[PDB]
Design a protein around this ligand. Structure first.
Ligand SMILES: [Zn+2]
Length: 186
């Protein structure tokens, strides 16, 4: 089973996480994570990293599946509360949603929040219901805003101490996507 990368190069971050337009040429999904272990009111562990995949692959090769299989080792330690945060470039498909729901049903000491740059195939009902299902499972699903993109820049990128520079329309696109997500998650 696949280990996470440490970080993205700046060119990849800007390309992969751009919040559209419509992002036709984005046939990968990239996924940044933080995992925080809390035991007796204190941080016992902090792990970060990145998984990726093609939009061509069998669903079981999805970045979220890689994260889930990787995380399920001694990387999980039964007595500890885990806070997992994902920042994904495309929102998760129905089956990943299903797998996460099973994963969380399985491991009840884990919480999860998903920030997503873009909404994947969102005109169609399957991808909407995948998101609703995560919400129902008690998983927060949020559109990435400026501070989320900056947070990723500052944690998951070989940024060479250069600052985060937003692209034109970042904020505009955020609001559109946030409206679409909100509407879909009622
Ligand atoms: Zn998936």
């Amino acid at each position: 089973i696949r280990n996470p990368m440490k970080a993205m190069y700046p060119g990849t971050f800007y390309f992969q996480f751009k919040n559209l337009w419509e992002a036709n040429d984005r046939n990968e999904t990239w996924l940044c994570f933080t995992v925080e272990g809390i035991k007796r009111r204190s941080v016992v562990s902090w792990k970060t990293g990145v998984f990726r995949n093609q939009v061509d692959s069998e669903t079981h090769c999805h970045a979220e599946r890689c994260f889930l299989s990787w995380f399920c080792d001694d990387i999980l330690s039964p007595n500890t509360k885990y806070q997992v945060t994902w920042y994904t470039s495309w929102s998760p498909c129905p089956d990943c949603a299903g797998e996460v729901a099973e994963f969380l049903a399985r491991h009840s000491n884990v919480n999860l929040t998903i920030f997503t740059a873009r909404l994947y195939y969102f005109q169609y009902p399957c991808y909407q219901e995948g998101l609703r299902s995560l919400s129902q499972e008690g998983v927060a699903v949020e559109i990435m805003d400026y501070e989320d993109f900056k947070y990723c820049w500052e944690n998951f990128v070989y940024n060479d101490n250069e600052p985060f520079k937003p692209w034109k329309g970042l904020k505009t696109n955020f609001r559109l996507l946030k409206r679409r997500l909100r509407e879909s998650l009622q």
